[PDB]
Structures are given as C-alpha cells and as structure tokens.
Amino acid sequence: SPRTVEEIFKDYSARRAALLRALTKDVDDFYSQCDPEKENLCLYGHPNESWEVNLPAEEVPPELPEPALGINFARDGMQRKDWLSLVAVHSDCWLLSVSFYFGARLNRNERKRLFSLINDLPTLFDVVTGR
Amino acid sequence: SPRTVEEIFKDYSARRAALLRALTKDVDDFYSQCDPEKENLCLYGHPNESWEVNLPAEEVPPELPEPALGINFARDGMQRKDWLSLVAVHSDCWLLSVSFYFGARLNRNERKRLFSLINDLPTLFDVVTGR
C-alpha cells in the first residue's frame, strides 16, 4: 500500500483523475451506468486512473473505505446537476477517506502536508458545480 | 446541518469524543456490542457525544457518509489491539469524511482551516495504539 506522503498523494491524484473523468468527460456514460433498476451501485476511482461503477465489496469490512452506496437509487429522484453534485461530494469525501486510511501512521506534520496537497486541487464538487 | 468551520469542528469534536470513549473508557462494552454472531455492524459517533453500534442505514444512499461496515466480523479474527486500531483508523476516516461532507461549500482556505483544527487533536488511531 502507499505509505509515504508522496506515495499516498500519487494514489489520491490518480483516483481523483478517474473520478473527475467519470463526472465530466464520461458523464453521459457514467450517468447511464447508474441504472436505477440494478442493485445498489458505487462509483470507484482506481490508482490506474480508471473509473468503475459496480456493486460494493462482497466481504466486509473491506480493505479500503468504501464509496457511497446506491447512488443509482438517487438518480431519477433528482435533477441531473443535483445528482452529479451529490456524487461529487461523496466522491471527494471517499478520496479523502482513502488517503488518510493509507496515512494512518503519518505524523501531524505529514498529515498537514498531505491535506495541503489535496486541498490545492479543485474539489470534484467545485468542478461539477462550477464554483 | 453544520456549515461554518466552527460549526463543523464543534460537530467533529463531539462525534470524536464519542468514538474515543467507545475505544478507551467504554472499550469492554463496545467490544461486547460488536458480537461476531450479529448481522454486520457499524460504530457511529453522534453530535450529542453518544456512541452507537448498530446496523447500517436501511435506505441508501444515506444522508451522511457511512462508517465502515461489519467491524464485528473482524473482531475475533485478529488480536484485540489490532482490531481496535482497525476500528480506530476507519473511525478517523469517517470523522474526516463527515466533516468535509458538511464542508463541501467551504472555500479552499476555510477547508484548510478546518483541517488545522482537526489536526491539532490526536487521531483515534494515535490514542489507541499509544503513539
């Protein structure tokens, strides 16, 4: 697993690139993959910069923090831009949770550095909402 | 819902106080609550400083980010110190996720300020592992 600040932020940046792609460049296909008729689905960002919509981990507790569950159950009950912003904030929170899971053994100064690297990139919520 | 840095940190501190109590002062009670034979359980910390072990939210996606699922399924598969540290890191991550869910509309500098308040406190992982 990523252990140094550099390794953890490299992982973060790649997962963020994946989710940014899902919510912008690939948003039409991402939207269509969140089929309300399917079982509960999650949006994953992977460290190879790919995004995936799939069922949650079969076995629990999972190795990594899990993304928000059942986003496809919320899709048709909201306007599209509001659903996308909801997915975006939950995705921002998941990215932060994953990084600080890997960063459990970082010291106070290293945690500050890791957050400063994350915080200097626009959040998915700010990108999607145009803030 | 908490909106300002100060409101979000007040909320964070109350949930963290609850989780810290579950993992230290109340650890025997919390350990017993996480019965491996029950259905999958989560550990919550609430803004009134109560902690709770219960099933996850029945309806998804939940209003707030969810804690790690099924921590009772890991209890008897590892040493007590390692299980408590596992719960602690996931709880640290949940606390961060909830705070920056509330803080989605904060700007960059206010998000940084919120993390500086959070990062002045020892993490639950730090406390439980004796760092």
């Binding site: 079982e39 509960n40 069922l55 059942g70 159950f73 009950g77 | 939210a57 029945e58 309806e59 998804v60």
Partner: peptide, 12 residues
C-alpha cells in the same frame, strides 16, 4: 412536479 424516490432499501 413528479418526485420519485431518492433512496431505496439496500440490496441485501
């Protein structure tokens, strides 16, 4: 307007 459900019971 029509308001569909925005949550549903988890699939399990």
């Amino acid at each position: 307007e029509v308001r569909q459900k925005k949550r549903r019971k988890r699939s399990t």
